[PDB]
Design a protein around this ligand. Structure first.
Ligand SMILES: Nc1ncnc2c1ncn2[C@@H]1O[C@@H]2COP(=O)(O)O[C@H]2[C@H]1O
Ligand SMILES: Nc1ncnc2c1ncn2[C@@H]1O[C@@H]2COP(=O)(O)O[C@H]2[C@H]1O
Ligand SMILES: Nc1ncnc2c1ncn2[C@@H]1O[C@@H]2COP(=O)(O)O[C@H]2[C@H]1O
Ligand SMILES: Nc1ncnc2c1ncn2[C@@H]1O[C@@H]2COP(=O)(O)O[C@H]2[C@H]1O
Ligand SMILES: [Mg+2]
Ligand SMILES: [Mg+2]
Ligand SMILES: [Mg+2]
Ligand SMILES: [Mg+2]
Lengths: 208, 208, 210, 210
């Protein structure tokens, strides 16, 4: 197993996945009037692991307990995304939907905080025009919160983009089009999900 | 440029193709009653390049005129397929349609000859029962014979499998499901087609 | 093989086997300055996609097994005509052309059984346009179990490089202390299972499957 | 390139660049028996995904350019804390773990501008759990008369191997006659274009992008 080798059958092997490009998505929307579309945030439009990594190293060195620590979220939602790297795949998707005049919504599962600068970070990085921009929506199971599925129905989103399985299942529970984005290999959120596990479309080269 | 090297973006780059597996196609047909389906022959179910390679070397060493030589066709359709290698992807597909009780048809652009043993070779290599088997259909512009499209319609084929672009557009012109098979890299019929150039489904690992 | 929608991920997409890939140009470059030498090539799945004949052979003599490989009648047909159905490999044309320019002596060592007559040498010389000056009649080493018949020939002709798709081709070169370079066996070949190219740390030529 | 449905073919799907890939296990095996030695690692995109800091730095001091790489205020931040946001690479952990078991002396060489203080050494020692006997303070190489070049440091510490993602990391190892090994730079790194790994015939570690 020091020199495993390979063969051409293995080199050409393809996973039965429905791949698509931004251009093909645009083409499929030809003629449709403006609509509402939504994006997950982490690993979908932003490589935000730097902040999650510092948070982990600061509150739960050997675990993920920091995800439930209020002190982590106050900092994550109010500045640490200044270290989050915007994804090129998202930049192209957002420009494309803005050209169409569609309404752009960002739905996140991050713990809601009193204040947040995530909305500002998104609008500046992706040059979203005021007419298409909407404040970040924090979905959750809390009583004062609405779940992700309710927010997709409420805003009448017709397309939802995300890297996680719950992003795709949410779209399917609403009967809308859920499109998978690939999570970068160096994300700290492991293991990487299996893109295409629901027979959904997956955007090519969307890891960066 | 002795050492062009590479980078991780190139390594993971994917063409926006809609890949599918035999299992997925099967699952997509659950509940449907037996129907009529068709297969292109060359490079779809049989690797027949051996016969054509010898044909050219025997009849047109410097051109593709052997394709017009009726002496070549007498040989190709009456024995040279004994050297043709059955494709495993076809084997899986044919066994699947048989289990369903579907009616299998083979359509070829090969020149028609008085006799032909291709039908026998096909029924024998894939163990096609008499109930599902049908004599090979030869098509073309000869006013004495029907074109590929016309044959697909006349037999009401719902699915057509092929490695070439005309196999897909033919299905498209008929409003049926056209599924692409990959042409082996060592086939003498070049250049290789761009599987997926029409947004059609392409079967994985179907080159052998 | 039991999951309807297995999906994938980017780490899996970019995953590489630790193999030493080389191109023909790189091989040629590593030979600059070297004087004409003797080099060898295995035949089946290295220089010729010959499965068509072995396929007709099995169907004709051993539909249920591999006894045809020991049948003298099979070898008569295979070595005297069936390679007319064998398809030359492009990767091989490039190597052979490269060695002809260098002025090297080209040898073909096969494990096929020796027969009274053989037209394989002629097929090779014609399909690859090998000059008489560099051509040598094919050496049929045969195939004796628990022993590698090729070693003897690589030593006697003092071959400095041996090209092959099978493990025994590479180990043969290793036994002689010479440079064994691997060629990929096509996926549609009937000789299965496919070998693990790079399993001895040897150089593997890119895109050599056709 | 602009075609909507480009499609593909099996020759393109199986196409391989002629590159010499190696695994960490192969590297370790090639060191078997050899006594402790000095080894060096480049920092950015080799052991740490540090783009987060450079991204924030550019956004803060040079929104419309690369001038921040010349601003002292940027380096102060970068070398004294912003690496808390740097993500350590797995390929690096495996390599450092292996050299630690061997007992080798580990050096980190960076082209980052030097500042009066720096917490980078501390970040690395902690992140990769390097024992005090194998750890050495980060070396800031450069042009300034108060410092030495990357080449000079590799020689001065007598490093036998040097790991890096950039072309100048590999040519530095070549100039010193030592073994230079390439690490793949992550696709989401902000330092672009990505370099052509294996452009010098060097060994390239597989799956080293994360
Ligand atoms: N260990 C982790 N490292 C990085 N990001 C994480 C980790 N665990 C969870 N996350 C992210 O935190 C987000 C919280 O809300 P979401 O469910 O929208 O999606 C989650 C992930 O994007
Ligand atoms: N050079 C060639 N090598 C192999 N097969 C060929 C070559 N030229 C034509 N063919 C095949 O001959 C077939 C004739 O009918 P089709 O058009 O269905 O498809 C054609 C190809 O599959
Ligand atoms: N089942 C098979 N299908 C195709 N070729 C085969 C098969 N079994 C053996 N061979 C070939 O027969 C050759 C005999 O000599 P070699 O060992 O040089 O290489 C062997 C293979 O190339
Ligand atoms: N735009 C950038 N994004 C990320 N890192 C960068 C960028 N420009 C320069 N660098 C890094 O800054 C480092 C300075 O020293 P090095 O030459 O060792 O390596 C350089 C790169 O790793
Ligand atoms: Mg996400
Ligand atoms: Mg065909
Ligand atoms: Mg062989
Ligand atoms: Mg670097």
């Amino acid at each position: 197993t020091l020199n495993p080798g390979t063969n051409v059958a293995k080199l050409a092997e393809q996973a039965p996945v429905h791949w698509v490009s931004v251009a093909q998505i645009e083409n499929s929307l030809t003629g449709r009037p403006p609509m509402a579309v939504g994006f997950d945030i982490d690993d979908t439009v932003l490589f935000s692991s730097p902040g999650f990594w510092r948070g982990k190293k600061t509150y739960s060195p050997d675990s993920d307990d920091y995800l439930k620590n209020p002190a982590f979220w106050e900092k994550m939602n109010n500045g640490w995304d200044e270290f989050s790297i915007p994804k090129e795949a998202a930049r192209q998707l957002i420009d494309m939907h803005v050209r169409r005049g569609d309404s752009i919504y960002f739905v996140t599962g991050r713990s809601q905080t009193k204040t947040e600068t995530v909305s500002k970070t998104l609008a500046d990085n992706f040059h979203i025009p005021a007419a298409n921009m909407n404040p970040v929506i924090f979905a959750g199971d809390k009583p004062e919160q609405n779940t992700k599925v309710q927010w997709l129905q409420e805003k009448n989103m017709r397309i939802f983009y995300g890297d996680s399985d719950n992003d795709i299942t949410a779209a399917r529970d609403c009967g809308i089009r859920g499109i998978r984005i690939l999570r970068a290999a160096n994300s700290t959120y492991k293991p990487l999900p299996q893109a295409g596990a629901f027979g959904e479309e997956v955007i090519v080269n969307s890891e960066y």
